[PDB]
GROMACS .gro file of N, CA and C in nm:
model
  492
    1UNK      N    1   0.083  -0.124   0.000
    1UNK     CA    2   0.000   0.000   0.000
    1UNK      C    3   0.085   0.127   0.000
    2UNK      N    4   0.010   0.204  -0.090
    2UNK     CA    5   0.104   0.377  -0.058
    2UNK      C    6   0.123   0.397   0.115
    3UNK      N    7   0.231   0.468   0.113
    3UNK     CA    8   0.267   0.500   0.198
    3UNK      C    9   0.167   0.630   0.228
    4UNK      N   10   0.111   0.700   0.386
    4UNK     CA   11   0.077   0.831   0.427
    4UNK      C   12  -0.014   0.780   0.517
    5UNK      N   13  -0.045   0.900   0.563
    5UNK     CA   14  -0.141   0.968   0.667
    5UNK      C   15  -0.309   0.919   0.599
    6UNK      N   16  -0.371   0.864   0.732
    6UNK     CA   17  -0.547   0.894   0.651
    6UNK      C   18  -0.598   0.915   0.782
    7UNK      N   19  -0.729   0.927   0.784
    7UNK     CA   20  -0.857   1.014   0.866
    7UNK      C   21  -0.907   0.939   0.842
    8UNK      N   22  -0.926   0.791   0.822
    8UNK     CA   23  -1.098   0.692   0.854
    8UNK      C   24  -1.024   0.626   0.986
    9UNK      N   25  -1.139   0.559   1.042
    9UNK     CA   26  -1.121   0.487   1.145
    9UNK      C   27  -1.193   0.339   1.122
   10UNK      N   28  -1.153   0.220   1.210
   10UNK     CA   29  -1.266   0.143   1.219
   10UNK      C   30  -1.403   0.104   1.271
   11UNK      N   31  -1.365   0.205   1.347
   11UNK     CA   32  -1.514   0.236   1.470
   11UNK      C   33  -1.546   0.384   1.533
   12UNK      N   34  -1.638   0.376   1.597
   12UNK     CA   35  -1.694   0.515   1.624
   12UNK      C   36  -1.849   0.512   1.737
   13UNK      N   37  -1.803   0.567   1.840
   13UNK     CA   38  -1.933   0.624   1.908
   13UNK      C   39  -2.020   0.715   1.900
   14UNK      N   40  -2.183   0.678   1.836
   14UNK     CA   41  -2.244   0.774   1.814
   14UNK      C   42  -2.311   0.795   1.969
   15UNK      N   43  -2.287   0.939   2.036
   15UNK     CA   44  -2.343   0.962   2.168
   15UNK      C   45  -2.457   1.045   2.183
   16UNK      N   46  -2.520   0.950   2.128
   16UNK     CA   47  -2.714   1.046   2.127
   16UNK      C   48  -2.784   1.066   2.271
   17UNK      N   49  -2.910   1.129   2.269
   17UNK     CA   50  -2.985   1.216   2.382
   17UNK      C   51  -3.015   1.068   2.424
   18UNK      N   52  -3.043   0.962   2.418
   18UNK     CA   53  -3.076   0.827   2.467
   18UNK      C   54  -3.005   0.713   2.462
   19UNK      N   55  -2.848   0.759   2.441
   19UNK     CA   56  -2.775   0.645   2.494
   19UNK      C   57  -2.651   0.647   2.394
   20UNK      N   58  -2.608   0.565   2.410
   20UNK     CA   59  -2.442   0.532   2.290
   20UNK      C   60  -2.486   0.401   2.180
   21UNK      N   61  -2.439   0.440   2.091
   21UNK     CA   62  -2.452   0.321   1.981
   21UNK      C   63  -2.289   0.319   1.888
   22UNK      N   64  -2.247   0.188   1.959
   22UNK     CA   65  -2.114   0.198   1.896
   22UNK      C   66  -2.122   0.141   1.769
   23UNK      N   67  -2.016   0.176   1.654
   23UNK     CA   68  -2.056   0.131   1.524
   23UNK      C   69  -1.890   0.113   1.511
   24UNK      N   70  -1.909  -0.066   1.397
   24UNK     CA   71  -1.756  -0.087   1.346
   24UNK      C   72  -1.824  -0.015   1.179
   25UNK      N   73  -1.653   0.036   1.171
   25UNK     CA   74  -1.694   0.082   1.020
   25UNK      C   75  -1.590   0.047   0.894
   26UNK      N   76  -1.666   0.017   0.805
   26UNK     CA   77  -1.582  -0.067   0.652
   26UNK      C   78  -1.519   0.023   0.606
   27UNK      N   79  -1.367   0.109   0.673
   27UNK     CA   80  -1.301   0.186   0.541
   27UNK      C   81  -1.222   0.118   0.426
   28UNK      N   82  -1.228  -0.010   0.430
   28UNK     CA   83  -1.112  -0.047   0.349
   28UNK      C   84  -1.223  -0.083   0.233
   29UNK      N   85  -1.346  -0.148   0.262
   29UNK     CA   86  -1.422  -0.152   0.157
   29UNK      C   87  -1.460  -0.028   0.095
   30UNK      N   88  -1.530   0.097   0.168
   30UNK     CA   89  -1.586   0.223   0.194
   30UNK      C   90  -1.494   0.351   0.231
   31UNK      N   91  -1.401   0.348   0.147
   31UNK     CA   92  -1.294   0.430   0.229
   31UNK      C   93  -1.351   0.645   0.206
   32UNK      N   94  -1.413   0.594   0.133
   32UNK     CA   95  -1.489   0.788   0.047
   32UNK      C   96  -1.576   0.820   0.164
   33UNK      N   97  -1.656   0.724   0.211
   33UNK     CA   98  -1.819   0.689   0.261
   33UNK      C   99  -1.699   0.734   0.454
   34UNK      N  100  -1.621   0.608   0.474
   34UNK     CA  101  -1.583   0.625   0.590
   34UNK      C  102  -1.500   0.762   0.659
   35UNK      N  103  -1.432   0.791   0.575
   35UNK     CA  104  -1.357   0.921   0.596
   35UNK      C  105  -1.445   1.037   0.543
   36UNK      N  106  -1.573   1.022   0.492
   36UNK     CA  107  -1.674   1.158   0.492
   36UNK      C  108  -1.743   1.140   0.650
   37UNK      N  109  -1.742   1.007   0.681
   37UNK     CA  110  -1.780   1.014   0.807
   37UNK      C  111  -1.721   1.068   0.936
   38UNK      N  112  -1.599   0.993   0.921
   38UNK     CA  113  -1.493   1.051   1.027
   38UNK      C  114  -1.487   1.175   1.042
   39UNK      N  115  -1.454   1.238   0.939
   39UNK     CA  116  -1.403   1.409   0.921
   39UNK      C  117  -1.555   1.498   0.971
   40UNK      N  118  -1.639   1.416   0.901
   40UNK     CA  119  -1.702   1.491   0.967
   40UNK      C  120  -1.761   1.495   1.130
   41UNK      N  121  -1.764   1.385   1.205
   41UNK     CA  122  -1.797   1.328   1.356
   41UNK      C  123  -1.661   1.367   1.421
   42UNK      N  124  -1.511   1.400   1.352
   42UNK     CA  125  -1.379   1.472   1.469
   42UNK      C  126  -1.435   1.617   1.440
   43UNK      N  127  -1.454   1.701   1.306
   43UNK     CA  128  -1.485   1.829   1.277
   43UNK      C  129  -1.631   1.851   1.407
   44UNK      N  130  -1.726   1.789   1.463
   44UNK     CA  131  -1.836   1.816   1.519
   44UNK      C  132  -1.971   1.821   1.398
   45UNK      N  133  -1.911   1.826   1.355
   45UNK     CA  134  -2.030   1.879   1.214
   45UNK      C  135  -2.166   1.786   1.242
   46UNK      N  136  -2.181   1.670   1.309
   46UNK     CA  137  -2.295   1.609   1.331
   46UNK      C  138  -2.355   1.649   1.511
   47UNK      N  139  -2.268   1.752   1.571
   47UNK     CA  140  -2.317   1.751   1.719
   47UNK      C  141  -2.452   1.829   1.690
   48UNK      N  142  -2.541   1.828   1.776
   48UNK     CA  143  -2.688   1.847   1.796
   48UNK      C  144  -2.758   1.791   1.675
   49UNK      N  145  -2.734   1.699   1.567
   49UNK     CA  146  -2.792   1.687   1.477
   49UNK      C  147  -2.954   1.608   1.525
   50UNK      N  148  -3.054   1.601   1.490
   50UNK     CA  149  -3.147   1.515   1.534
   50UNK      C  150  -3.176   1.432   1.426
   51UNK      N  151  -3.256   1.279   1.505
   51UNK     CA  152  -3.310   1.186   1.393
   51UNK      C  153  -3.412   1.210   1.406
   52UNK      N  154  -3.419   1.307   1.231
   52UNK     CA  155  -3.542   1.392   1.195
   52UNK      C  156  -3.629   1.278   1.125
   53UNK      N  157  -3.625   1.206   1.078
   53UNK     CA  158  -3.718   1.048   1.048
   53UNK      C  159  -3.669   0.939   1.083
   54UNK      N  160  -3.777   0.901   1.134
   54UNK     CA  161  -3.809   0.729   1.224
   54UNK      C  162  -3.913   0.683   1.201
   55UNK      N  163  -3.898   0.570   1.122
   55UNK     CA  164  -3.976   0.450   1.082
   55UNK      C  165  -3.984   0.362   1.193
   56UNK      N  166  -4.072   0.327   1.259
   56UNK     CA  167  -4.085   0.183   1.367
   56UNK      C  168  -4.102   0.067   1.271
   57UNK      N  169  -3.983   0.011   1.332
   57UNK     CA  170  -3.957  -0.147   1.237
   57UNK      C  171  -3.926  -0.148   1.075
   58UNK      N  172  -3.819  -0.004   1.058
   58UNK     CA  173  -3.746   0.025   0.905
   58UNK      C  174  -3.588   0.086   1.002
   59UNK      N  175  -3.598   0.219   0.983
   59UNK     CA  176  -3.516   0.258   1.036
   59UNK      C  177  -3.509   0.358   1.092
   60UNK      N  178  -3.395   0.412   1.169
   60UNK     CA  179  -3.383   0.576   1.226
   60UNK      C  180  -3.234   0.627   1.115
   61UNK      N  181  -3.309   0.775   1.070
   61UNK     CA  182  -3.238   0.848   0.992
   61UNK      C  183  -3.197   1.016   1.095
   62UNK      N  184  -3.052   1.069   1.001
   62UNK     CA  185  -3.002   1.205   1.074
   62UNK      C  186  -2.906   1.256   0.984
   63UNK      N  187  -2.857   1.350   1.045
   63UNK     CA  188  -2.704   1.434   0.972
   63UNK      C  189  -2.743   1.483   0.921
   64UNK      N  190  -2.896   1.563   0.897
   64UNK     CA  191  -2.891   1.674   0.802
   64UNK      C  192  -2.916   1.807   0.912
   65UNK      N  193  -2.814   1.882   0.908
   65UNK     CA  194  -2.847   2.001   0.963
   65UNK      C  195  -2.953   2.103   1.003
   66UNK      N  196  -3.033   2.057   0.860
   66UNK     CA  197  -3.134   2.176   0.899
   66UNK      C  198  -3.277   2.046   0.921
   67UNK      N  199  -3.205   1.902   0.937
   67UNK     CA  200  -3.349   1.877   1.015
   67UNK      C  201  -3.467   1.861   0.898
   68UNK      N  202  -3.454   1.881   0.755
   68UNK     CA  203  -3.562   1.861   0.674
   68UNK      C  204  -3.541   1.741   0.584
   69UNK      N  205  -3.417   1.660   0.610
   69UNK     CA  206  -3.429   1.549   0.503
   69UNK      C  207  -3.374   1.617   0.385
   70UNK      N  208  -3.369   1.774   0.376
   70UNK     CA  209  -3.304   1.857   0.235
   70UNK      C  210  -3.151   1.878   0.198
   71UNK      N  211  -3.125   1.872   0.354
   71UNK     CA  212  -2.997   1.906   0.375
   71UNK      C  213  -2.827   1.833   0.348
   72UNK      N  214  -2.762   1.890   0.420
   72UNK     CA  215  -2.634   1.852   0.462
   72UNK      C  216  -2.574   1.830   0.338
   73UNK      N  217  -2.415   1.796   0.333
   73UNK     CA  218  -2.342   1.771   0.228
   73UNK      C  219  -2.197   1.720   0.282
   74UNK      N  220  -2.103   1.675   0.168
   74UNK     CA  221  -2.002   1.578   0.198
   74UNK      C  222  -1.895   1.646   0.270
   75UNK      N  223  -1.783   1.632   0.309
   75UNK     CA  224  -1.644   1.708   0.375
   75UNK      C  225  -1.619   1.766   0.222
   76UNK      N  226  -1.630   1.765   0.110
   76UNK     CA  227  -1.614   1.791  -0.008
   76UNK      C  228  -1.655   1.888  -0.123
   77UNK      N  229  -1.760   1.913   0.003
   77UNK     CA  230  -1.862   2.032  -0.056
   77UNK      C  231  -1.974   2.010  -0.131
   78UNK      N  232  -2.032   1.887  -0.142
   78UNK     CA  233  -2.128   1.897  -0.247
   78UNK      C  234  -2.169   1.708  -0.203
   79UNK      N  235  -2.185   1.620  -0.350
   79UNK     CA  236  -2.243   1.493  -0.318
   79UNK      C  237  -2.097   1.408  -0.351
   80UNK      N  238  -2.107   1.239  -0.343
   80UNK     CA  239  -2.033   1.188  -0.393
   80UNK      C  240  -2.085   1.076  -0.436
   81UNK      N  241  -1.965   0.973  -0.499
   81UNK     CA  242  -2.013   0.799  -0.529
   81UNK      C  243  -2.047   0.746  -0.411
   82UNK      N  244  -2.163   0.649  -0.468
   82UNK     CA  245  -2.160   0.507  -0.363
   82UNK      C  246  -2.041   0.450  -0.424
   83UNK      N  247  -2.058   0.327  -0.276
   83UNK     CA  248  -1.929   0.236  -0.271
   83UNK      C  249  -1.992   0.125  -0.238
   84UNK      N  250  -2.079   0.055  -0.318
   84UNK     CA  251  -2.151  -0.073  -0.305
   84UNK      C  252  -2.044  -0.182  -0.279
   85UNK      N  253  -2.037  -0.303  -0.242
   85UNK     CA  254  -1.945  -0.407  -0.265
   85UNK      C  255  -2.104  -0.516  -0.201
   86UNK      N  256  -2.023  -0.602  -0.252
   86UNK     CA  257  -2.116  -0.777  -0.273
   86UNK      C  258  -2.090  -0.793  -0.130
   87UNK      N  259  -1.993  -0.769  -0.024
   87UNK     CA  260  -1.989  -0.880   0.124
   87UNK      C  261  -2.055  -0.751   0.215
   88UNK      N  262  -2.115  -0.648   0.182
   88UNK     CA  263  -2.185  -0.554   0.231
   88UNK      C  264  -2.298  -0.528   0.220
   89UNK      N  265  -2.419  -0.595   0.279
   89UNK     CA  266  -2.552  -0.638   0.292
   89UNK      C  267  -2.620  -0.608   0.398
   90UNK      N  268  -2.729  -0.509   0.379
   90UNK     CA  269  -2.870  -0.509   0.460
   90UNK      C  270  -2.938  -0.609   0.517
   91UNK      N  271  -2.851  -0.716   0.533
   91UNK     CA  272  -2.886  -0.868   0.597
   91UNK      C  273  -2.915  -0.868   0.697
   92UNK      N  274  -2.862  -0.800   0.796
   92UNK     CA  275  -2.871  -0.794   0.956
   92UNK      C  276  -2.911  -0.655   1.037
   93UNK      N  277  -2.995  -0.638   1.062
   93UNK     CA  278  -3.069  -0.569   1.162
   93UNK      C  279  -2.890  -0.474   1.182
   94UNK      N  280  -2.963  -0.384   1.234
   94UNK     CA  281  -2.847  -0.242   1.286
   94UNK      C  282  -2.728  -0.200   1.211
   95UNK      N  283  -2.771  -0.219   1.037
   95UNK     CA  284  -2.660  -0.207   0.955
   95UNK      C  285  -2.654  -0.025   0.922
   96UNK      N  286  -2.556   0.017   0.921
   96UNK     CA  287  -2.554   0.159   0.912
   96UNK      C  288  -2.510   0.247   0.735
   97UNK      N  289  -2.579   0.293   0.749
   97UNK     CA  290  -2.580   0.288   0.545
   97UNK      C  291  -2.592   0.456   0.518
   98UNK      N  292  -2.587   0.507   0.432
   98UNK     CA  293  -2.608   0.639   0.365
   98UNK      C  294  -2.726   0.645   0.304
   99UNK      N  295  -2.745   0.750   0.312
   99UNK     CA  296  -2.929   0.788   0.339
   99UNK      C  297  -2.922   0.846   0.170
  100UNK      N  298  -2.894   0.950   0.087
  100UNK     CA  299  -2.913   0.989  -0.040
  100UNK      C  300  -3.006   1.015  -0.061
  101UNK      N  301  -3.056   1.074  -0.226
  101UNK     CA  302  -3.153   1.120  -0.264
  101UNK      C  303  -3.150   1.063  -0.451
  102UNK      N  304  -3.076   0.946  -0.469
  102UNK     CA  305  -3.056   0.899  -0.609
  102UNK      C  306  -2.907   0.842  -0.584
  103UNK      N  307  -2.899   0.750  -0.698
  103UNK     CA  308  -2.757   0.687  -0.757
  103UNK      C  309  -2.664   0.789  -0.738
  104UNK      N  310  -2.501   0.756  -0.642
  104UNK     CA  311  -2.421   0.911  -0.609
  104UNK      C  312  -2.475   1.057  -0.595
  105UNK      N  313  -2.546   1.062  -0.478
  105UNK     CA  314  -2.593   1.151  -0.450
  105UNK      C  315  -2.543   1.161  -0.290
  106UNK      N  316  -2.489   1.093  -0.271
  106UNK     CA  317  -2.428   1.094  -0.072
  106UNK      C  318  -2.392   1.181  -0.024
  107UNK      N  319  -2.400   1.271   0.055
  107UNK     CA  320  -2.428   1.362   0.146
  107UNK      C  321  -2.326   1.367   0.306
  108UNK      N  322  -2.455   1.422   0.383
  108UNK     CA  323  -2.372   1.379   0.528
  108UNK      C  324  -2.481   1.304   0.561
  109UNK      N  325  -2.629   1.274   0.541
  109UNK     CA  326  -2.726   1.224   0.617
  109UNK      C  327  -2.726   1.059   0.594
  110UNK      N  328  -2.725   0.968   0.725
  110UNK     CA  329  -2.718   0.881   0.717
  110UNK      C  330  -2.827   0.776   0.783
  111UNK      N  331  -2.837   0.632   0.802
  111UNK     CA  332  -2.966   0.555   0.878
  111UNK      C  333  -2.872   0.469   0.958
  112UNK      N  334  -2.976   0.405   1.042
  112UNK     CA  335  -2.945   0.293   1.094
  112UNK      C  336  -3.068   0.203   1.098
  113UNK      N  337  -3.055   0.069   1.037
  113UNK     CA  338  -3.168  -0.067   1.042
  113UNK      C  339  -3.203  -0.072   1.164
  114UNK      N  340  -3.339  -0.157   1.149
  114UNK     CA  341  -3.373  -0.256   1.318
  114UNK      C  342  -3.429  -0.344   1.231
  115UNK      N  343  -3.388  -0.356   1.127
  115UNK     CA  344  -3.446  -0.540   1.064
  115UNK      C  345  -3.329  -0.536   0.926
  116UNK      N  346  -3.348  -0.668   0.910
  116UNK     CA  347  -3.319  -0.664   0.761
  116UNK      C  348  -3.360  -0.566   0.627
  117UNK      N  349  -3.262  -0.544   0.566
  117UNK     CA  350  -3.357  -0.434   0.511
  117UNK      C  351  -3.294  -0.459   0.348
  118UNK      N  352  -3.310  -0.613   0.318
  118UNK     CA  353  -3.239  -0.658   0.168
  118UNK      C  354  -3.273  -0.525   0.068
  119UNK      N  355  -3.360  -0.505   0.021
  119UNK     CA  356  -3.438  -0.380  -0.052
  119UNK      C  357  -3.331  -0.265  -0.105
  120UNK      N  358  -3.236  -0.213  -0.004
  120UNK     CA  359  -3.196  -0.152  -0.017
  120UNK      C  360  -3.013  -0.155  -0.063
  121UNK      N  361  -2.992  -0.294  -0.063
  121UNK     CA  362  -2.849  -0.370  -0.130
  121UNK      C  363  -2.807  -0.282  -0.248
  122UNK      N  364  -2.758  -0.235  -0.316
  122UNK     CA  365  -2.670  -0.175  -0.384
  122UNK      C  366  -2.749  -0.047  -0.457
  123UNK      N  367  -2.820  -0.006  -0.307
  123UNK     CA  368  -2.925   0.165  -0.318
  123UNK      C  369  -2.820   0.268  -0.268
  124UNK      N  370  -2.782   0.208  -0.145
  124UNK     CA  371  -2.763   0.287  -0.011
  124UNK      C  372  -2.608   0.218   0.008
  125UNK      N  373  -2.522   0.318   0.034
  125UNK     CA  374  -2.383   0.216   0.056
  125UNK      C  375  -2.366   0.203   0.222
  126UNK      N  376  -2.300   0.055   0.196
  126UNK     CA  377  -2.362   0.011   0.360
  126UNK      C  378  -2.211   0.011   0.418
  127UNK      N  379  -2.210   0.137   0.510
  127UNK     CA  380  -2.067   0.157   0.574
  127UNK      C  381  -2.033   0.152   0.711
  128UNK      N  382  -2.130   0.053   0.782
  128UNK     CA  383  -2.094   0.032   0.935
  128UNK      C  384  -2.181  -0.088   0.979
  129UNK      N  385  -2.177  -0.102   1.094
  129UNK     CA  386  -2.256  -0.225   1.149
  129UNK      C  387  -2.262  -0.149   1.302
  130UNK      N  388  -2.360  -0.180   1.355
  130UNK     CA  389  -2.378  -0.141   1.495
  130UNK      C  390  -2.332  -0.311   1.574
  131UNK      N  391  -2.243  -0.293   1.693
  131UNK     CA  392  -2.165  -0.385   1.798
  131UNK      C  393  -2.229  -0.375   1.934
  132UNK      N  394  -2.243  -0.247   1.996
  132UNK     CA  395  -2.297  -0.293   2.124
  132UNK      C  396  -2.411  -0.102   2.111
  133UNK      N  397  -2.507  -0.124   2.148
  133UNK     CA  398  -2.613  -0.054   2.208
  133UNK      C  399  -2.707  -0.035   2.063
  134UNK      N  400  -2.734  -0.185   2.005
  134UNK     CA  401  -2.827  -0.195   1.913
  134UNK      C  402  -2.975  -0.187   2.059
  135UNK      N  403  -3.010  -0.208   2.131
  135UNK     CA  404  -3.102  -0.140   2.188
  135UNK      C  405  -3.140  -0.015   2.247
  136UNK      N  406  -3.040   0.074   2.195
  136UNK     CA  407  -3.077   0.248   2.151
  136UNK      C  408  -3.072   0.262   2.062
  137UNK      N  409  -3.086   0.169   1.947
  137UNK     CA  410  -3.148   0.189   1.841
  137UNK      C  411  -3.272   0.131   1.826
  138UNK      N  412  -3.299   0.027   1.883
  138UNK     CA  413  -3.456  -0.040   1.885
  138UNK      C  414  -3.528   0.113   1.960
  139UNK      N  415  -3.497   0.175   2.061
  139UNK     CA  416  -3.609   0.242   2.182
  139UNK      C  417  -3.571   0.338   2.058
  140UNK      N  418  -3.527   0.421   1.969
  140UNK     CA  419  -3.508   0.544   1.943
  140UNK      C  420  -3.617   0.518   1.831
  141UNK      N  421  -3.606   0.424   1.755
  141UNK     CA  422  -3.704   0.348   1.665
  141UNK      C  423  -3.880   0.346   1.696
  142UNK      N  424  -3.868   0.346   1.847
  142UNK     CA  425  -3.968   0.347   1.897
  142UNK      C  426  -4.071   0.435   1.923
  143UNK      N  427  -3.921   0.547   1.940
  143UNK     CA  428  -4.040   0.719   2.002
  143UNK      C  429  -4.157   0.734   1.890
  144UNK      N  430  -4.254   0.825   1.968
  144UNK     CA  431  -4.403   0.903   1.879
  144UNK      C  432  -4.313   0.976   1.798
  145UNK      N  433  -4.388   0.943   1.689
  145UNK     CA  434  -4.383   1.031   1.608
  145UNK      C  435  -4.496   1.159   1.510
  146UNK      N  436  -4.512   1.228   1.440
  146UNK     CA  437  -4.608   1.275   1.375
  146UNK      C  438  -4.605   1.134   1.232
  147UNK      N  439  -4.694   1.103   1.213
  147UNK     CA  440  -4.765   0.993   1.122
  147UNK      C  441  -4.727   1.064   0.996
  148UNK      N  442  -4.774   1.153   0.960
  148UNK     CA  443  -4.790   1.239   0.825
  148UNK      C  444  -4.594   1.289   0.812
  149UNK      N  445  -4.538   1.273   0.878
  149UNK     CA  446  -4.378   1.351   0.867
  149UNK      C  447  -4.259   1.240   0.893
  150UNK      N  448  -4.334   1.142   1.009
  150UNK     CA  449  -4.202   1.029   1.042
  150UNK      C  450  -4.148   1.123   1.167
  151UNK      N  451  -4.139   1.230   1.176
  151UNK     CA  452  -4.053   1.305   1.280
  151UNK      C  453  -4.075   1.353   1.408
  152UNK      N  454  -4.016   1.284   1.495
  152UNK     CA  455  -4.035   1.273   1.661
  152UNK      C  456  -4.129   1.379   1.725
  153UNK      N  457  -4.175   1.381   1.764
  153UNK     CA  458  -4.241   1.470   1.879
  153UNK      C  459  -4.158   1.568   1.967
  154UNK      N  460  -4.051   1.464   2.012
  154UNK     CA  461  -3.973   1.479   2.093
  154UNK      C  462  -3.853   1.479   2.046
  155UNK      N  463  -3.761   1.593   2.000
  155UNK     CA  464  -3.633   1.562   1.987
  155UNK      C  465  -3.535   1.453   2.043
  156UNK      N  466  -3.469   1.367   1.900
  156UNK     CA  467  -3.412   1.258   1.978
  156UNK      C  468  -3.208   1.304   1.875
  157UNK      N  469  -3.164   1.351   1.942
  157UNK     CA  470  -3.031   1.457   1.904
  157UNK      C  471  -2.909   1.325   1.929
  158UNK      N  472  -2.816   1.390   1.843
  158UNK     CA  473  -2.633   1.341   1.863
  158UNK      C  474  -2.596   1.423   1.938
  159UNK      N  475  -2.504   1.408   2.033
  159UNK     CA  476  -2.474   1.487   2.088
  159UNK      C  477  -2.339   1.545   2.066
  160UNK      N  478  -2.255   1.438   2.001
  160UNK     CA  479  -2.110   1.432   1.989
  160UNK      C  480  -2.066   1.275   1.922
  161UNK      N  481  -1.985   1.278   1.853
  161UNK     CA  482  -1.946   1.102   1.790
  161UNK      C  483  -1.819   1.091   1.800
  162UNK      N  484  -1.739   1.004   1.897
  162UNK     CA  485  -1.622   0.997   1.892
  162UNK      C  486  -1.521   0.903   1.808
  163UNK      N  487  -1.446   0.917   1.723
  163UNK     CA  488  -1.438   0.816   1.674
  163UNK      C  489  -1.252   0.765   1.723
  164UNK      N  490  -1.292   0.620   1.710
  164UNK     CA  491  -1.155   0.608   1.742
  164UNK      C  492  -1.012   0.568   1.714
   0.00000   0.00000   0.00000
């Protein structure tokens, strides 16, 4: 491998208003996807963000700044490629993926599963797995929401993501 310096990590604590959800993350598969992540969770750029849509029994979505699903953008300024690969599958409940708005359209806004979610296999590039506090992701999954919007009642915020 070239020799230098990089900014992805393999893991990372997301530290939301209801608990920690640690996530391992694929840079060697995902290295664009992982280091838009990193840079942006050491920069802060995701602190107070909220998960502005929640599906009960799909997923919980965030990282857009202004909170409308319109927002946010890459460390790059704008969108980028997915980074699909075949051993990276919506197979297992608490898989952590990029949220988009079309084919390379990736952003900063991202999801996390509470089921299988095959459907979305080479939609959404799948760049983490949740390890320990997949049950703050089931309860966050859970809160009221408005029916007509998906979006909490109750603010459910990041507070900070450490990565390590």
């Amino acid at each position: 491998q070239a020799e230098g310096p990089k900014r992805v990590s393999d893991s990372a604590i997301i530290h939301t208003s209801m608990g920690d959800i640690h996530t391992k993350l694929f840079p060697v598969e995902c290295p664009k996807t992982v280091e838009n992540f990193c840079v942006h969770s050491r920069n802060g750029y995701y602190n107070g963000h909220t998960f502005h849509r929640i599906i009960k029994g799909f997923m919980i979505q965030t990282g857009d700044p202004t909170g409308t699903g319109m927002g946010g953008e890459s460390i790059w300024g704008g969108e980028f490629e997915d980074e699909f690969h075949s051993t990276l599958r919506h197979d297992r409940p608490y898989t952590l993926s990029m949220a988009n708005a079309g084919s390379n359209t990736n952003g900063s806004q991202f999801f996390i599963t509470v089921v299988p979610t095959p459907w979305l296999d080479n939609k959404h590039t799948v760049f983490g797995r949740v390890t320990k506090g997949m049950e703050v992701v089931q309860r966050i999954s859970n809160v009221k929401v408005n029916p007509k919007t998906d979006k909490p009642y109750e603010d459910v915020s990041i507070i900070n993501i450490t990565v390590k």
